[PDB]
Structures are given as C-alpha cells and as structure tokens.
Design a protein around this nucleic acid. Sequence first.
RNA 1: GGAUAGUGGCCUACCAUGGUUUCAACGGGUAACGGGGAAUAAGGGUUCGAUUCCGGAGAGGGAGCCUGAGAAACGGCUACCACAUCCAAGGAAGGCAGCAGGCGCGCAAAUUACCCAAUCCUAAUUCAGGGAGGUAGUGACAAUAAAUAACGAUACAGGUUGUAUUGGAAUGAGUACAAUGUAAAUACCUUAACGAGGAACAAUUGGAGGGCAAGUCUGGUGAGCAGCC
Lengths: 144, 185, 130, 99
Amino acid sequence: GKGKPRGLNSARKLRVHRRNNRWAENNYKKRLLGTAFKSSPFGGSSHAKGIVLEKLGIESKQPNSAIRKCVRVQLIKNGKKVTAFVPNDGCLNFVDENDEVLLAGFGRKGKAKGDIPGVRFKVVKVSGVSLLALWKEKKEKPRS
Amino acid sequence: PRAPRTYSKTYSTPKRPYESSRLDAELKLAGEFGLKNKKEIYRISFQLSKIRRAARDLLTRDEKDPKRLFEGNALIRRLVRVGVLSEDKKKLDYVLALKVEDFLERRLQTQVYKLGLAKSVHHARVLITQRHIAVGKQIVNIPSFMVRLDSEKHIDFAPTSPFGGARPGRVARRNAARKAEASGE
Amino acid sequence: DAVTIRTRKVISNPLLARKQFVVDVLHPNRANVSKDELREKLAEVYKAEKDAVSVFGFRTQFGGGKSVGFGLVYNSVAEAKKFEPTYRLVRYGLAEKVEKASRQQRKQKKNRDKKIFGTGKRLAKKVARR
Amino acid sequence: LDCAKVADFVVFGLSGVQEVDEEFGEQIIRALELQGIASYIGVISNLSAVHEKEKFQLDVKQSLESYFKHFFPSEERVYNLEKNSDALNVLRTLCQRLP
RNA sequence: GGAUAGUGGCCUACCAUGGUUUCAACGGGUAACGGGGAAUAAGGGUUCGAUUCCGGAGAGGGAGCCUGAGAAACGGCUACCACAUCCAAGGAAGGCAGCAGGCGCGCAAAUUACCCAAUCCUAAUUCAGGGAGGUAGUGACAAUAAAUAACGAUACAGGUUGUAUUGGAAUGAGUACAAUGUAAAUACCUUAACGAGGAACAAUUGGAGGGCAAGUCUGGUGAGCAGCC
C-alpha cells in the first residue's frame, strides 16, 4: 500500500527518492543553484546604494488613478539600472539628479507592491540623511 | 582569551498580541499588585512554565525510581521554603495546580503592605526604593525580592532613616532652619 | 560611636614569618575607617611594631555600617621589608618611589643601541672628523 | 559666500564660550548649504577656556556636536584643536582625503 | 638493489597483466577548513558553525636550502614572477592574514593611550624581558535589576470610591570635603555640605474598515493611503 517501499532494508531507495523530489520546492532550488548571486540586482544583500539618473511618474494600475512618483537609479557595485519608489509625496522635492541614495526592498520579497507595476524598491536615505527626518523637519539636507 | 561569561534571557512574549480577553486579565493583576509593566507578569509565567515542564517529566518515571525521589523532593522542598506551596499540599501532583497569583503574593512589595507600615501597594513601592525598609540588618531596595518564610519576623524600618530613628531628612531640616532664623528676627 | 575590630580565619605561616587573617570592622555613623587607623589598633593588639602591620583590599557593605578586608602582621620589621611587595611599602612610606622613564621611551632607547656594535667611543671620533 | 563658493574644504570655527547668534552666525551656515558645499569640517579651538575638570569640557563638546549635526548629519565628530591628537587628525584629513 | 630515522612503487632494473564500478567508480560544482557546538522546544526533523577549546594549513605567488634535538621557518637566507622605496644615477634596501594607525572596498565593524600589580612563559635566572596578558577610552550586538511621584485637608458627588483649591513630609539624578578602591588613576560601594511644584528635573515609537486592541468626533480636499481585501 501507499506506493512507497516499507521493507526494513529499503533505506537507500527512500532517501534517493526524496532528493529527486526536493527540486520541485521553489525556494529550495534557489539556494542550491545560487540564483541570488548570479542574478537579481542586490547580490543577496538587504540594501544597496545607487545614483539617481532621472525623475519619473508612474500611473497606478486599475482600478485606482494616480501618477505615482519614481526615479531611475544605477547601482554602484553592479552597474545595474533600477526604478525606485519615493514615499511621502512632497518628499520628492528632496531628490535630484546625481544624488546618492540608499535603497531597500519594497516589502514583497522581490515582487512589486500594490498598484505599482514593476516597482520593487523604496528610497530610505538621500545624501546621508533619512527621508523620514526631512519629512518631519528634524534635519536639513546640504546641497551638492 | 578568557573563558566566556554565560547569560540567559528571563521572559517570554505571548504568541498572539491582540487576544482581547487576555489583555483584560493582565491589567487586573497590575492594578492589584502595583506592577509597572506587562514584562513583570511575563517573567512570572515564564518561571511557572519551566517548573511544570520539569514536574510533568518526572511523573513519567515510576515511583521509587531513584531520580524521581531525589529531584522531586528537592523541587517540593524549594517551593515550600518561600511559601508558594503550602506544606499541606506537599506532594508533586499539586505543583501542577499553582498559578501566577501564588508567586506575586510573596514579593516584598506586597508583604510590606499586608504587615501595615505602608497603606497602599503604591505607597509600599515608594518606601522600598527610597531605602526605608530592612530585612534583618540588611537594607533592601528591590521590590521583587522573594520573602522566605523565616524572614517575615524581621521586616522593619532601617536604623539609618527617619521612621527608623535617625535624623530628620533634608527638607525637614531646611524648614526648621528658616523658621528658627525668622524666629530670631 | 566606638569602632569594633574583629579577626577571623587566623593562620600562622612560619614559611613567610607572618600571621594572616580576615579583618572585619563595624563602624556605625561614619563613612568608613582609614587604613592608617586600622594599622595602629592591630599593632597594639598583636603586640607588634606598626611597621610590621600591613592591610589591604577593603569593601563596605551595601547600605553601609560594615567593611571587610585582609591583614598581615610580620614577626619583625626586617622580615616585612623583604617579603612585602614594593608598592605596599610605598603606601606606608617605608620605601621611596623609583623614577624610571615612561615605558615607550625605554623601548625606543633599546632599539637605538642594537644598531651599535662595541662600546662606541670609536665611531664618535670618526664622525667628528667626517 | 564668494570665498566659500570656490573651496574644497570649509573649516567651521566654533566657540566653547559664546554660542552662535541666530541673526548672523546661523545665516552663514544656512546660506552655504543652499548654494552647496564641497566638504565640511567642525572644529573647536578654545574649549579649555571653560575648564574646571575636563568632564565639564566634554559636557560642552557633546552639546556642540548635537547642534552641528543638525546641519550636517553626515558628520558625528567635532575636533578639539587644543589636543595634539585631534589637530594632527584634522591635518591628515585635509592632505589625504578627496572632496 | 638504492635512499630514509625507519616500513612501503618511495625510486631504479627485470618479470607478470593486473586494480575500481549501477551497493554509482571516474568527471564537474561548492558564495566547503573538520569537530565540541548554535537557533527553533509535542515527537520526528529543518537550518547554521570565518569566530574564546581541540586538530590542520599559510605568511604577496611558486621553488630551493643553511643552523639545530626539533623548520622545508618567512619579525632566517637564495633565485625567478608581480608590485614597490631611497639615490650624488655609481648603487642600496623590501613583505602588518602580530598591536595601534592609514588608503581602497562596501549595507556592514573602536585609541598611532597606561602597566608588568594579577595569569603564565623564557633565560646562565627569586631580581631581567613579554602590544602574550591585564587596565582605561570608544560601544542602544545581545543580556540582568529598575526612576519619571507618594500622602493628608477643603469643596462636590457617590456609598469607604471618584472630580477640582490647599499643606507638610520623603528621595536620587547631579555636584562635592574625605576615606576606600588601584601599579597609579576613573567608576561602583560608603559619606559632611548643596540639590523639585506646571516637582521646564516636561518618555518615546507605531496605529484607530477587516485580519487585529482602539473614533456615527470635527475642519478641509475631491493628490494620497494600502504587505492582502
């Protein structure tokens, strides 16, 4: 019964069968192949730093309507090019081209977040000062 | 390099944060015994958890197993000494029936209230932290100090304070001086 | 209030010509007692010269009133002077502080001398001629 | 402004004795930030003028750093030039580091 | 037979044709030093171990060798390869994956401080030496304990409990004579003097449709919010 061998000396077949079937588990396969080193923008690190190339607006997916505000960034270690979201609305006034920014994941383990098609990262710091501190008027950005 | 210093964590966090019925039960204890945190409750339930784990393990062992005899007697003896378990209930099956209020009842903060001296559990805490209470000769200033059954006879005001027989405090002295100086005017 | 001094765990140690013991002190209504006062009272109770008594390592109980430390009394002033560490003798004024240069300076001198072979009375003359 | 506009390094002098005045001293800092600055260093030169014990000097120095960091949050140190170790450290930075 | 401290295709001469494998040999990959161990507690498991103890390997990369009981040593030497310092241009000198420090890199990590007082080691030695080791500085990695207020009066309401004008008491945070501490110091423990009434001596960080504790409040608006709906 149950289509699997039970006999007391059958251990070799059981374990070999298990190995062949783990390759169907999606996150297991990622570790053994080393996919995060060979591909994806962060080399498996939680953050990366980059330089702002240009400013963009991205309209929401249906049913909502809003042009959401984004920037193009180039990562310093990889040279790869990425689009990042900028939280808190008017905080877009603090970012300008050739600024340096720190990026973090947008909370969905490599998927884009909510309405926003294909935007996977959010800005955390600009020029070495945090956006949250600027929004609440706690610090000031020196220009460059 | 020198051998490592060992250390361990003393509390555990409830696994569902917003279980409304639990939030009500905790707040009654803090109001009754004058605690400042939920952590003071988590600490006690963490200790009680481990006592049950050990006791429940021993009960799988047969009676007259030498290990059950040796370690079971130690555990019972140790809880009786602090008065958490009555010496009538001096049997291992009753250890599984203890509850949190049995431990909080033994803290120095509450004993100093039941004896008199203070007049609320909030007043009792202030006196301890301000160094007015002694157990035997030693001044004690920690509210969570577990009072062993022998010590209850020896709780009293410290010798080196007002209320205990020393000089008046800094503010009483200042008032007497100004009034005395004005009375010379 | 009167101070009370007690001694405990008394050991006689012929191998180093001394007695060694715990010193226990009760001192209500004062901060503590100075080592200099303890040295005097121990000297007269063990019938010794003051220079033969040595006392170290005190702490006072939480909440005050009591202190505990360790004490020695030697069989003579001469024997104390040979077995005692020099730093303790300085505290008692039985010895004089030596005046060496700082640890970094001494090392740097050594490394300069390693580069000279012989006594160096020669070479100096040769350089003077250049 | 015209002088600071061309510099690679601007050295800000702070006084331990008298704190900056809002009507003038701060307006220097605020204006320089908004035209842009290639790099900046915070310096103290007279902290021993309030000596009683150097812990009292440390209390003041902590206040100045907290103030200075408000304008330049990238920096967390203000040097005391009365100490040889700090002043050498400043000199090294100007020589070695790029703006 | 030679060589080695010594066994052995370890090497040489002659001779035979053997050795391993679907019970996975051989080949490829490892962001692979092994182990004692670490996190996660129904049980069985899953993931991790550069890092305080034990064993191995290396001193920019390869090779060779002297001295010695012991080294194929790198704070010993010789050559080549790659870097790189001083110069009178003839020549000379080099190896921080020891401690402190600098540049570069990056999301990512401390002082060019004091001392042999303790733990121990080395020498012809009780005595000299030891960045091994200890002390202090920096330090919200993680861990333990625990302040930010307690009690009367009066007025009002309620059955001894709530809501507002008013009065004496209590104390450390902080500062400081002194002693103690220490190799000498700093700090802790102890203590004369000073040290609270908006006790400004003023606690933050995230939320209020559901999952999931908590707004039919009120003003504005017709870019913002939302891990998911």
